[PDB]
Coordinates of C-alpha atoms in Angstrom, one line a residue:
Chain A
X1 CA -54.1 -11.2 -9.9
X2 CA -57.9 -11.3 -8.3
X3 CA -57.8 -14.7 -7.3
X4 CA -54.8 -13.7 -4.6
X5 CA -57.0 -11.1 -3.4
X6 CA -59.8 -13.9 -3.5
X7 CA -58.7 -16.7 -1.9
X8 CA -55.3 -15.2 0.7
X9 CA -56.1 -18.0 3.2
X10 CA -55.3 -20.3 0.9
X11 CA -52.6 -18.3 -0.4
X12 CA -51.3 -18.1 3.6
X13 CA -51.5 -22.2 3.9
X14 CA -49.8 -22.6 0.5
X15 CA -46.8 -20.0 1.4
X16 CA -45.5 -21.0 4.8
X17 CA -42.2 -20.8 4.9
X18 CA -39.4 -20.8 7.6
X19 CA -37.1 -17.4 6.5
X20 CA -34.1 -16.3 9.0
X21 CA -31.9 -19.1 8.9
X22 CA -29.4 -18.4 11.6
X23 CA -26.0 -18.2 9.9
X24 CA -22.9 -19.7 11.3
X25 CA -24.3 -23.3 11.1
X26 CA -23.8 -25.7 8.4
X27 CA -26.9 -26.0 6.3
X28 CA -27.7 -29.3 4.2
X29 CA -30.0 -28.3 0.9
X30 CA -31.3 -31.9 0.5
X31 CA -31.7 -33.8 -3.0
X32 CA -35.0 -32.5 -5.0
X33 CA -33.9 -35.8 -6.7
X34 CA -33.8 -38.9 -4.1
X35 CA -32.4 -41.1 -6.7
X36 CA -29.4 -38.4 -7.5
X37 CA -27.0 -40.5 -4.6
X38 CA -25.4 -42.0 -7.4
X39 CA -23.8 -38.6 -8.3
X40 CA -22.3 -38.4 -5.0
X41 CA -20.1 -35.2 -5.0
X42 CA -21.5 -34.4 -8.7
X43 CA -24.4 -32.5 -6.2
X44 CA -23.4 -29.4 -4.2
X45 CA -26.1 -29.7 -1.2
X46 CA -23.9 -28.1 1.3
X47 CA -24.7 -24.4 1.9
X48 CA -22.1 -22.2 4.3
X49 CA -22.6 -18.3 4.7
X50 CA -19.1 -17.0 5.7
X51 CA -19.9 -14.1 8.6
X52 CA -16.5 -11.9 9.3
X53 CA -13.7 -10.9 7.3
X54 CA -10.6 -9.1 8.9
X55 CA -8.9 -6.7 7.1
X56 CA -5.2 -6.7 8.3
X57 CA -4.2 -3.0 8.0
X58 CA -0.9 -1.3 9.0
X59 CA -0.1 1.9 10.3
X60 CA 2.6 3.9 8.2
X61 CA 3.8 7.6 7.8
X62 CA 3.1 7.6 4.2
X63 CA 6.4 7.0 2.0
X64 CA 9.0 9.3 3.0
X65 CA 12.0 9.6 1.0
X66 CA 13.3 13.1 1.3
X67 CA 12.6 16.0 3.5
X68 CA 9.7 17.6 1.6
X69 CA 7.3 14.3 2.8
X70 CA 4.4 15.7 4.8
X71 CA 5.7 13.6 8.2
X72 CA 9.1 15.5 7.6
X73 CA 6.5 18.5 7.1
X74 CA 4.4 17.9 10.4
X75 CA 8.0 17.0 12.2
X76 CA 8.8 20.4 11.8
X77 CA 6.0 22.0 12.6
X78 CA 5.4 20.2 16.0
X79 CA 9.2 20.5 16.6
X80 CA 8.5 24.4 16.1
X81 CA 5.4 24.8 18.2
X82 CA 6.7 22.5 21.0
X83 CA 10.3 24.1 21.3
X84 CA 9.0 27.6 20.5
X85 CA 7.1 27.6 24.0
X86 CA 9.8 25.6 25.7
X87 CA 12.6 27.0 27.8
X88 CA 14.7 24.3 29.0
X89 CA 15.4 21.1 27.6
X90 CA 17.1 21.2 23.8
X91 CA 18.4 17.9 23.2
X92 CA 16.3 16.3 20.6
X93 CA 14.9 17.1 17.0
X94 CA 11.7 17.2 15.2
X95 CA 12.5 13.3 13.7
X96 CA 12.9 12.3 17.6
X97 CA 9.6 13.8 18.4
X98 CA 8.2 12.4 15.6
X99 CA 9.2 8.5 16.3
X100 CA 8.0 9.4 19.9
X101 CA 4.5 10.1 18.3
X102 CA 4.6 7.2 16.7
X103 CA 5.4 5.0 19.5
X104 CA 2.6 6.7 21.0
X105 CA 0.2 6.0 18.3
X106 CA 1.4 2.6 18.0
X107 CA 0.7 1.6 21.7
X108 CA -2.7 3.4 21.5
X109 CA -3.4 1.0 18.4
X110 CA -2.5 -1.9 20.7
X111 CA -5.2 -0.7 23.3
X112 CA -7.7 -0.2 21.0
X113 CA -7.0 -3.9 19.9
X114 CA -7.2 -5.4 23.1
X115 CA -10.0 -3.6 24.2
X116 CA -11.8 -4.7 21.2
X117 CA -10.9 -8.4 22.1
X118 CA -12.6 -7.9 25.4
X119 CA -16.1 -6.6 24.3
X120 CA -16.2 -9.0 21.4
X121 CA -16.4 -11.6 23.6
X122 CA -19.1 -10.7 26.0
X123 CA -21.4 -10.9 22.0
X124 CA -24.0 -13.9 22.0
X125 CA -26.9 -13.7 19.8
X126 CA -29.2 -16.7 18.6
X127 CA -29.3 -15.4 15.2
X128 CA -25.4 -15.9 14.4
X129 CA -23.3 -18.9 15.4
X130 CA -20.2 -16.8 14.8
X131 CA -20.5 -14.9 17.4
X132 CA -17.7 -14.2 19.2
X133 CA -15.5 -17.3 18.5
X134 CA -15.1 -17.1 14.9
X135 CA -14.1 -13.1 15.7
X136 CA -11.9 -13.9 18.6
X137 CA -10.2 -16.4 16.5
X138 CA -9.7 -14.0 13.4
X139 CA -8.0 -11.4 16.0
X140 CA -5.9 -14.5 17.2
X141 CA -6.6 -14.7 20.6
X142 CA -8.3 -18.2 22.6
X143 CA -11.9 -17.9 23.2
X144 CA -11.6 -20.2 26.1
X145 CA -8.8 -18.2 27.6
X146 CA -11.1 -14.9 27.2
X147 CA -14.1 -16.8 29.0
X148 CA -12.1 -18.0 31.8
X149 CA -10.3 -14.6 32.4
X150 CA -12.5 -12.2 31.1
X151 CA -11.7 -10.5 34.5
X152 CA -7.7 -10.7 34.3
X153 CA -8.2 -8.8 30.6
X154 CA -10.5 -6.3 32.0
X155 CA -8.1 -5.3 34.3
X156 CA -5.0 -5.7 32.0
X157 CA -6.3 -3.4 29.4
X158 CA -7.2 -1.1 32.3
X159 CA -3.8 -1.0 33.5
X160 CA -3.0 -0.9 29.8
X161 CA -4.3 2.5 29.8
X162 CA -2.9 3.9 32.9
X163 CA 0.4 2.9 31.5
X164 CA -0.5 4.8 28.4
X165 CA -1.1 7.9 30.3
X166 CA 2.4 8.4 31.2
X167 CA 3.3 9.7 28.0
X168 CA 1.9 12.9 26.1
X169 CA 0.5 12.9 22.4
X170 CA -1.5 15.4 21.1
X171 CA -5.2 15.2 20.8
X172 CA -5.2 17.7 17.7
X173 CA -3.7 15.4 15.4
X174 CA -6.0 12.9 14.3
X175 CA -3.6 10.1 13.9
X176 CA -4.6 8.5 16.6
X177 CA -8.5 8.8 16.6
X178 CA -8.5 7.6 13.0
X179 CA -6.1 4.2 14.0
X180 CA -8.5 3.5 17.3
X181 CA -11.7 4.3 15.6
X182 CA -10.3 2.0 12.6
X183 CA -9.4 -0.9 15.0
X184 CA -11.6 -0.7 17.8
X185 CA -15.0 -1.3 16.1
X186 CA -17.2 -4.0 14.1
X187 CA -18.9 -3.1 10.8
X188 CA -21.5 -4.7 9.3
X189 CA -22.0 -4.9 5.1
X190 CA -25.6 -4.1 5.2
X191 CA -27.9 -2.9 8.0
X192 CA -29.7 -6.6 8.5
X193 CA -30.2 -8.7 11.7
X194 CA -28.0 -11.6 10.0
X195 CA -24.9 -9.4 8.3
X196 CA -21.3 -10.0 7.9
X197 CA -18.8 -8.3 10.3
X198 CA -16.0 -6.2 8.7
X199 CA -12.8 -6.1 11.1
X200 CA -9.4 -4.1 11.6
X201 CA -6.5 -6.3 12.7
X202 CA -2.7 -4.5 13.3
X203 CA -0.7 -6.6 11.3
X204 CA 2.2 -4.9 12.9
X205 CA 3.8 -2.5 15.5
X206 CA 6.4 -0.3 15.9
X207 CA 8.7 -1.3 18.7
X208 CA 10.8 1.7 19.1
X209 CA 14.3 0.5 19.4
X210 CA 16.4 2.9 20.4
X211 CA 20.2 1.9 20.4
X212 CA 23.4 3.4 18.9
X213 CA 24.0 7.3 18.4
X214 CA 23.3 6.7 14.8
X215 CA 19.5 8.0 15.6
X216 CA 16.5 5.8 16.2
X217 CA 14.8 3.3 14.1
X218 CA 10.8 1.6 14.5
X219 CA 11.9 -1.6 13.7
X220 CA 8.8 -3.9 13.2
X221 CA 6.9 -6.0 16.0
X222 CA 4.6 -9.0 14.8
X223 CA 1.2 -9.3 15.8
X224 CA -0.7 -12.8 16.2
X225 CA -2.7 -14.1 12.9
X226 CA -5.7 -15.8 13.0
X227 CA -5.7 -19.3 14.2
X228 CA -3.5 -18.8 17.2
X229 CA -4.5 -19.9 20.5
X230 CA -3.0 -16.6 21.8
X231 CA -3.8 -16.1 25.6
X232 CA -3.6 -13.1 28.1
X233 CA 0.0 -13.9 29.0
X234 CA 1.3 -13.7 25.2
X235 CA -0.4 -10.4 25.3
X236 CA 0.9 -9.3 28.4
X237 CA 4.6 -10.2 27.0
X238 CA 3.6 -8.2 23.9
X239 CA 2.9 -5.2 25.5
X240 CA 6.2 -5.6 27.9
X241 CA 8.2 -6.0 24.8
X242 CA 6.4 -3.0 23.3
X243 CA 7.3 -0.6 26.2
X244 CA 10.6 -2.3 27.2
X245 CA 12.9 0.2 25.0
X246 CA 10.2 2.7 25.8
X247 CA 10.1 3.8 29.7
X248 CA 13.5 4.4 31.4
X249 CA 14.4 6.4 28.6
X250 CA 15.6 9.8 29.9
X251 CA 15.4 11.7 26.6
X252 CA 11.7 9.9 26.2
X253 CA 10.9 11.4 29.6
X254 CA 12.3 14.8 28.3
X255 CA 9.9 14.6 25.1
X256 CA 7.2 13.8 27.3
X257 CA 7.3 16.4 29.9
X258 CA 7.8 19.3 26.6
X259 CA 5.1 18.2 25.2
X260 CA 2.8 18.0 28.5
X261 CA 3.9 22.1 28.7
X262 CA 3.2 22.4 24.7
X263 CA -0.5 21.0 24.7
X264 CA -2.2 21.3 28.0
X265 CA -3.2 18.1 29.9
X266 CA -6.7 19.2 28.7
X267 CA -5.4 19.0 25.3
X268 CA -3.6 15.5 25.5
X269 CA -5.0 11.9 24.2
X270 CA -6.4 10.4 26.7
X271 CA -7.4 6.5 26.5
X272 CA -10.9 5.8 28.3
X273 CA -11.3 3.6 30.8
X274 CA -13.6 0.2 30.2
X275 CA -15.5 -1.6 32.7
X276 CA -17.6 -5.1 33.0
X277 CA -21.0 -2.9 31.4
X278 CA -19.3 -1.7 28.3
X279 CA -20.8 -3.4 25.2
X280 CA -19.5 -3.0 21.7
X281 CA -21.9 -3.3 19.2
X282 CA -21.6 -3.4 15.2
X283 CA -22.7 -0.6 13.4
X284 CA -23.3 0.2 9.6
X285 CA -20.8 2.7 8.2
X286 CA -20.9 3.1 4.3
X287 CA -17.8 5.2 4.8
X288 CA -15.3 2.8 5.9
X289 CA -17.4 0.2 3.6
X290 CA -16.1 2.3 0.4
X291 CA -13.0 2.4 1.6
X292 CA -12.6 -1.4 2.4
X293 CA -14.1 -2.0 -1.2
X294 CA -11.3 0.2 -2.7
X295 CA -8.7 -1.4 -0.6
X296 CA -5.3 -3.2 -2.4
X297 CA -3.0 -5.6 -0.8
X298 CA 0.0 -5.2 -0.2
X299 CA 1.8 -8.5 1.1
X300 CA 3.5 -9.3 4.2
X301 CA 5.7 -7.2 6.0
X302 CA 9.4 -7.9 5.4
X303 CA 11.5 -8.3 8.8
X304 CA 15.3 -8.9 9.2
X305 CA 14.7 -12.6 10.1
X306 CA 13.0 -13.2 6.8
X307 CA 15.3 -14.1 4.0
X308 CA 15.1 -12.8 0.8
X309 CA 17.2 -13.9 -2.3
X310 CA 18.7 -10.8 -3.9
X311 CA 16.9 -7.8 -2.1
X312 CA 19.2 -7.8 1.3
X313 CA 18.5 -5.1 3.7
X314 CA 14.9 -4.4 2.5
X315 CA 13.2 -4.4 5.9
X316 CA 9.9 -2.2 6.8
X317 CA 12.0 -0.1 9.1
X318 CA 11.2 3.9 10.0
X319 CA 15.2 4.7 9.4
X320 CA 16.2 7.7 11.2
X321 CA 19.9 9.2 10.4
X322 CA 20.9 12.7 10.8
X323 CA 24.2 12.1 8.5
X324 CA 21.8 10.5 6.0
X325 CA 19.3 12.6 3.5
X326 CA 20.0 15.2 5.9
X327 CA 18.2 14.1 8.9
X328 CA 15.1 13.6 7.1
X329 CA 12.8 10.9 8.2
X330 CA 12.8 7.7 5.9
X331 CA 10.3 5.1 5.5
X332 CA 10.7 3.5 1.5
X333 CA 9.3 0.1 2.0
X334 CA 9.0 -2.8 -1.1
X335 CA 5.5 -4.4 -1.4
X336 CA 4.9 -7.6 -2.9
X337 CA 6.2 -9.8 0.0
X338 CA 4.0 -13.0 0.6
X339 CA 5.9 -14.7 3.2
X340 CA 8.2 -17.1 1.4
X341 CA 10.9 -17.2 -0.9
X342 CA 9.2 -17.4 -4.2
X343 CA 8.0 -15.2 -6.7
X344 CA 3.9 -15.5 -6.7
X345 CA 3.1 -14.7 -9.7
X346 CA -0.2 -13.7 -8.8
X347 CA 1.4 -10.3 -7.3
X348 CA 1.4 -9.4 -11.2
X349 CA -2.2 -8.5 -11.6
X350 CA -1.8 -5.2 -9.5
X351 CA 0.4 -3.5 -12.0
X352 CA -2.8 -2.4 -14.0
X353 CA -4.4 0.7 -13.4
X354 CA -7.1 0.2 -10.1
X355 CA -10.6 1.2 -10.7
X356 CA -12.3 3.1 -7.7
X357 CA -15.8 1.9 -7.7
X358 CA -18.3 3.9 -5.7
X359 CA -22.2 3.6 -4.4
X360 CA -24.5 6.5 -5.5
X361 CA -24.3 8.9 -8.6
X362 CA -23.2 12.3 -6.8
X363 CA -19.8 11.7 -4.6
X364 CA -18.4 14.5 -2.6
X365 CA -14.9 15.6 -2.1
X366 CA -14.5 14.3 0.9
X367 CA -16.3 11.0 0.3
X368 CA -14.1 10.4 -2.4
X369 CA -11.3 11.2 -0.5
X370 CA -12.1 8.4 2.4
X371 CA -12.8 5.9 -0.4
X372 CA -9.5 5.6 -1.4
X373 CA -7.4 5.7 1.8
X374 CA -6.2 1.9 1.6
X375 CA -5.8 1.9 -2.0
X376 CA -2.2 1.5 -3.2
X377 CA -0.7 0.6 -6.4
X378 CA 2.8 -0.3 -7.5
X379 CA 4.9 1.7 -9.4
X380 CA 8.1 0.2 -10.2
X381 CA 9.9 -3.1 -9.6
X382 CA 12.2 -3.0 -6.8
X383 CA 16.0 -3.3 -8.5
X384 CA 17.4 -7.0 -7.3
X385 CA 21.1 -6.8 -5.9
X386 CA 23.0 -9.5 -7.5
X387 CA 22.3 -12.0 -10.4
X388 CA 19.3 -13.9 -8.3
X389 CA 16.1 -12.6 -8.0
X390 CA 13.5 -15.2 -6.9
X391 CA 11.1 -12.7 -5.2
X392 CA 9.7 -9.6 -7.0
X393 CA 9.2 -6.6 -5.0
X394 CA 7.2 -3.4 -5.9
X395 CA 8.1 0.2 -5.2
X396 CA 4.6 1.6 -4.3
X397 CA 4.1 5.3 -6.1
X398 CA 2.9 6.5 -2.5
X399 CA 0.5 5.2 0.4
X400 CA -2.0 6.6 2.9
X401 CA -1.6 6.2 6.8
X402 CA -2.8 2.9 6.4
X403 CA -1.7 -0.5 4.3
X404 CA -3.6 -3.4 4.0
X405 CA -1.2 -6.9 4.1
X406 CA -4.2 -9.8 3.9
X407 CA -7.8 -10.2 4.3
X408 CA -8.9 -13.1 6.7
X409 CA -12.2 -14.7 6.3
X410 CA -13.6 -17.3 9.0
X411 CA -16.4 -19.4 7.6
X412 CA -17.8 -22.8 8.5
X413 CA -16.2 -25.8 6.9
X414 CA -18.4 -28.3 4.7
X415 CA -17.3 -31.4 6.1
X416 CA -17.5 -32.4 9.3
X417 CA -17.8 -31.6 12.2
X418 CA -18.2 -27.9 10.2
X419 CA -15.9 -25.6 12.4
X420 CA -14.6 -22.5 11.4
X421 CA -12.0 -22.1 8.5
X422 CA -9.3 -20.1 8.4
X423 CA -8.5 -18.1 4.9
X424 CA -5.9 -15.5 4.3
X425 CA -5.8 -14.0 0.8
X426 CA -4.6 -10.7 -0.3
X427 CA -6.6 -9.2 -3.3
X428 CA -4.7 -11.6 -6.3
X429 CA -5.3 -15.7 -5.8
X430 CA -3.5 -17.9 -8.2
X431 CA -4.5 -21.2 -8.8
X432 CA -2.4 -23.8 -10.2
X433 CA -3.7 -27.1 -11.5
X434 CA -4.9 -29.4 -9.2
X435 CA -8.0 -31.6 -8.3
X436 CA -9.2 -29.6 -5.8
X437 CA -7.7 -26.2 -6.2
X438 CA -10.5 -24.6 -8.7
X439 CA -13.6 -25.9 -6.4
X440 CA -11.6 -24.1 -3.4
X441 CA -11.3 -21.2 -5.5
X442 CA -15.0 -21.0 -6.3
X443 CA -16.1 -21.7 -2.5
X444 CA -13.5 -18.7 -1.8
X445 CA -15.4 -16.6 -4.6
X446 CA -18.6 -17.6 -3.4
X447 CA -18.0 -16.5 -0.1
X448 CA -16.1 -13.5 -0.6
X449 CA -19.4 -12.2 -3.1
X450 CA -21.5 -12.7 0.3
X451 CA -19.5 -9.6 1.9
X452 CA -21.3 -6.4 0.5
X453 CA -18.3 -4.1 -0.6
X454 CA -15.8 -6.6 -0.9
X455 CA -12.3 -5.8 -2.0
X456 CA -12.2 -6.3 -5.7
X457 CA -10.7 -9.4 -6.6
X458 CA -7.7 -10.4 -9.6
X459 CA -7.9 -13.9 -10.2
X460 CA -5.0 -15.6 -12.1
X461 CA -4.5 -19.1 -13.3
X462 CA -1.1 -20.9 -13.9
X463 CA -2.3 -23.0 -16.8
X464 CA -3.4 -20.5 -19.0
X465 CA -0.8 -18.0 -17.8
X466 CA -3.7 -15.4 -17.6
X467 CA -4.8 -13.3 -15.0
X468 CA -8.3 -11.4 -14.6
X469 CA -9.4 -7.8 -13.9
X470 CA -11.7 -6.7 -10.8
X471 CA -14.0 -9.7 -9.7
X472 CA -16.5 -7.2 -8.7
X473 CA -20.0 -5.3 -9.5
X474 CA -19.4 -2.4 -10.9
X475 CA -21.6 0.4 -10.2
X476 CA -20.2 4.2 -10.7
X477 CA -16.3 3.8 -11.2
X478 CA -13.7 5.6 -12.6
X479 CA -9.8 4.7 -13.7
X480 CA -7.2 6.0 -11.3
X481 CA -3.7 6.8 -12.4
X482 CA -0.8 6.3 -9.9
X483 CA -0.3 10.4 -9.9
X484 CA -3.6 11.1 -8.8
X485 CA -3.6 8.2 -6.4
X486 CA -0.6 10.5 -5.2
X487 CA -2.1 13.7 -5.0
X488 CA -4.8 12.0 -3.0
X489 CA -2.6 10.6 -0.6
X490 CA -0.4 13.4 0.1
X491 CA -3.7 15.4 0.8
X492 CA -4.5 12.6 3.0
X493 CA -1.7 12.7 5.1
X494 CA -0.6 15.8 5.4
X495 CA -4.4 16.2 6.7
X496 CA -4.0 13.5 9.3
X497 CA -1.2 14.8 10.6
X498 CA -2.0 18.3 11.4
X499 CA -2.1 20.0 14.6
Chain B
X1 CA 13.9 48.0 33.3
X2 CA 12.4 50.1 30.1
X3 CA 14.5 47.6 27.8
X4 CA 12.5 44.6 28.5
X5 CA 9.1 46.3 27.9
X6 CA 10.6 48.0 24.6
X7 CA 12.2 44.5 23.4
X8 CA 9.9 41.9 24.8
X9 CA 10.2 39.7 21.5
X10 CA 14.4 39.4 22.2
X11 CA 13.2 38.6 25.6
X12 CA 10.9 36.1 24.8
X13 CA 13.4 34.3 22.1
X14 CA 16.3 34.7 24.5
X15 CA 14.1 33.1 27.6
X16 CA 13.2 30.1 26.0
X17 CA 13.6 27.3 28.7
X18 CA 12.1 23.5 29.4
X19 CA 10.1 23.6 32.4
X20 CA 8.1 20.8 34.3
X21 CA 10.3 18.2 34.3
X22 CA 8.5 14.9 35.0
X23 CA 10.0 13.3 38.1
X24 CA 10.8 10.0 39.2
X25 CA 13.6 9.8 36.1
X26 CA 17.5 10.2 36.5
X27 CA 18.1 13.5 34.8
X28 CA 21.8 14.4 34.0
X29 CA 22.5 18.1 34.2
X30 CA 25.8 17.5 32.1
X31 CA 29.4 19.7 32.2
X32 CA 29.6 23.1 31.8
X33 CA 33.3 22.8 31.5
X34 CA 33.6 20.1 28.9
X35 CA 37.5 19.1 29.8
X36 CA 36.3 18.7 33.8
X37 CA 36.2 14.7 32.8
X38 CA 39.3 14.5 34.1
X39 CA 37.9 15.2 37.3
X40 CA 35.5 12.1 37.3
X41 CA 33.9 11.7 40.5
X42 CA 34.8 15.3 41.4
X43 CA 31.8 16.6 40.0
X44 CA 28.4 15.9 40.5
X45 CA 26.3 15.9 37.3
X46 CA 23.8 13.4 38.7
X47 CA 20.3 14.7 39.9
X48 CA 17.7 12.7 41.7
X49 CA 14.6 13.8 42.8
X50 CA 12.7 12.0 45.4
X51 CA 8.8 11.5 45.2
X52 CA 7.3 9.3 48.1
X53 CA 8.3 8.6 51.7
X54 CA 6.2 6.4 53.9
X55 CA 5.7 6.8 57.5
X56 CA 5.9 3.5 59.6
Chain C
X1 CA 18.3 39.2 1.6
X2 CA 17.8 37.6 5.1
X3 CA 14.5 38.6 5.6
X4 CA 13.4 37.6 2.4
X5 CA 15.0 34.2 3.2
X6 CA 13.0 34.2 6.7
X7 CA 9.9 35.2 5.1
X8 CA 9.8 32.6 2.0
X9 CA 10.2 29.4 4.6
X10 CA 6.7 29.9 6.0
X11 CA 5.1 29.8 2.2
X12 CA 2.7 26.7 1.4
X13 CA 0.1 26.5 -1.4
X14 CA -1.2 22.8 -2.2
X15 CA -1.1 23.6 -6.0
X16 CA 2.8 24.5 -5.7
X17 CA 4.9 22.3 -4.4
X18 CA 7.8 24.6 -5.3
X19 CA 7.2 26.6 -2.1
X20 CA 9.4 27.0 -0.3
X21 CA 12.3 24.3 -0.3
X22 CA 13.0 25.4 -4.1
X23 CA 12.8 28.7 -3.3
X24 CA 15.2 28.5 -0.8
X25 CA 17.4 26.2 -2.8
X26 CA 17.4 28.8 -5.2
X27 CA 18.5 31.6 -2.7
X28 CA 21.2 29.4 -1.5
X29 CA 20.5 28.3 2.3
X30 CA 19.5 24.9 3.8
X31 CA 15.8 24.8 4.4
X32 CA 16.3 22.4 7.1
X33 CA 18.8 24.3 8.9
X34 CA 16.0 27.4 8.5
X35 CA 13.6 24.9 10.0
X36 CA 15.5 24.0 12.7
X37 CA 16.7 27.1 13.9
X38 CA 13.8 29.5 13.1
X39 CA 14.4 31.0 16.2
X40 CA 17.9 31.9 15.8
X41 CA 17.2 32.8 12.2
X42 CA 14.5 35.5 13.5
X43 CA 17.2 36.7 16.4
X44 CA 19.9 37.0 13.9
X45 CA 17.9 38.6 11.0
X46 CA 16.3 41.2 13.8
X47 CA 19.6 42.2 14.9
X48 CA 21.0 42.7 11.5
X49 CA 18.2 44.9 11.4
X50 CA 19.1 46.6 14.3
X51 CA 22.7 47.0 13.4
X52 CA 21.9 48.1 10.1
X53 CA 19.7 50.9 11.5
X54 CA 22.2 52.6 13.6
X55 CA 23.6 54.3 10.6

């Protein structure tokens, strides 16, 4: 239009608009019709933008139920490598060496978690009100405690690194590097200033728990959830509990000495020290974005204290018995547990084949492999012992090194005083008949759409008795089968457990 | 001995021993005679290595 | 026979999961035992070759 070219001054004076609204603060759009107040709650003048979502992952060996599993193959390989350069101590097995290594991984994950907690609290920007209190709430700490005891937190994480330097683990194996990189980073969905932050929080750890002559057993160790005012004393208690049965074990000292002899001190994994001038910075990572987008929730871990009607002895433990399954490492968990002893009908929508969504047109093999690391489809229902089966558990076909349990989203409340909100959910949400459930689900959906590569959702309704497929924007997709997913997971786990 | 030079593979497979024990942790040498437990405290299977001494 | 038992256990390919557990099972050994005592197996087969080569 030549009129715009002829009157740019009037165009500029007519197009003066304030952009770049700082996120993390509640905004009211106002009323276009000033007399619409008679319809009080029939008009939505509120506008809240979420700014962070936490992916509650879990480190796993990858579906071992016999001696042909990648975990057992890596156990045999690492034991052969250690013992063929070892002249001396012969009192442990490949399985024992691998439980060590897994405990090393768990405490490395803990160190990365606490280091991220420390480095986040120094982040303050005018364009984002979520920084850093929302992130600290999502990770499950007390921002006031961190602000008051920054020095204590720094020295505690440094001491954690120093004490983790006592034992030795291989650095060629990429398990530790992948887990630390995943759990020690902030990821934006877009390369924009007011972007949304993606976080990974370990839902659980692997307290080593040696007792009895019937091998070892990695018992679950729970982790703080979002909205928990956990302090440095609680985190120190957690670390001491983790390393309580880890030091003072002469067999563990023997394993550490043998791996130190095998892999030289230069070839070990070392936790880097941190100081006051270390700044964590959100980064754009398309690979992590894609693998977050193609992630499927598996539910809460099952503990000994968790009651389950008809499913006894189904805890998430890594059992190692020399006289059971020929001494192979066994880890066969049952998914579909949410936390309460009821059906959780929403998990029924996970029984369909997953859809792998990818950006762009041409996809490389490595990118496709990295894009399905968190994907996990159920295969069969676990057989309930007894006539009562109030919960329903699904046995997976095979999973990768990490499994996603929940997703935590933090957003501004619509009501006064517009504080942060805690939203934990799986890939499937069940909405029963209620006055506010539908609008709450609508707010949930709109908040999730703000994130670019959000995980695909599977909504279900209690009144229609009908679920829904992926609630996502499909760009370049394919239908994945359980066998293909199992092959990809086997490849990825074997590659991760390599020396 | 030329036999060592002629069969280094068997020598290596016969001389696989774990060295470099981390100090500061108690080590038990075990029993060469498994029936020596009848002499309970007549045998010293313990092995503790000190690691620091302070000059006051 | 014993040399083949030892040599099969080091075979692995991504397109065939029968390598080498199925081959060892067919040969009639314990793959767990082979992977646990590879060094003893090599020494035993080497001594078998040495003692059979005398005649």
